[PDB]
Design a binder for this molecule. Structure first.
Ligand code: CA
Ligand code: CA
Ligand code: CA
Length: 131
């Protein structure tokens, strides 16, 4: 396989999230990914009832590296979406992709630091693979 998709249909209200709630988690087991597979990109497809505007945020993931606390984050992303639907893409660095933990409850986390349109739906999350 070269990719896996989930369709969570998850409604998010940004202004309702507390400080400790601004990362939204998805368990890797929900995708059906094998531990032989290397993730190269993550895409989050979102939609709203009005033009979305700017998103600012970051992705995090469970890892197998205990020295760094079993956790890694990518760089900050700013993306502007001109219409009622769009895609936020994280190109996963090689040094993170090699240690992602898909087993034992590992998660991918979608951090929302700001979004102009307050209410949106996560329609799908897509993992693209290397091999
Ligand atoms: Ca953990
Ligand atoms: Ca353990
Ligand atoms: Ca600010």
């Amino acid at each position: 396989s070269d990719g896996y998709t989930i369709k969570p249909n998850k409604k998010v209200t940004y202004s309702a999230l507390g400080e400790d709630e601004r990362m939204i988690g998805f368990s890797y087991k929900d995708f059906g990914i094998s531990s032989s597979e290397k993730i190269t990109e993550v895409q989050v497809n979102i939609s709203a009832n009005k033009n979305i505007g700017k998103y600012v945020g970051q992705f995090g993931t469970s890892t197998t590296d205990s020295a760094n606390g079993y956790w890694a984050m990518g760089d900050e992303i700013t993306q502007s979406i001109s219409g009622n639907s769009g895609t936020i893409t994280w190109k996963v660095p090689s040094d993170i992709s090699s240690i992602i933990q898909t087993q034992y409850g590992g998660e991918i986390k979608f951090g929302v630091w700001w979004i102009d349109c307050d209410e949106f739906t996560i329609d799908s999350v897509v993992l693209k693979l290397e091999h």
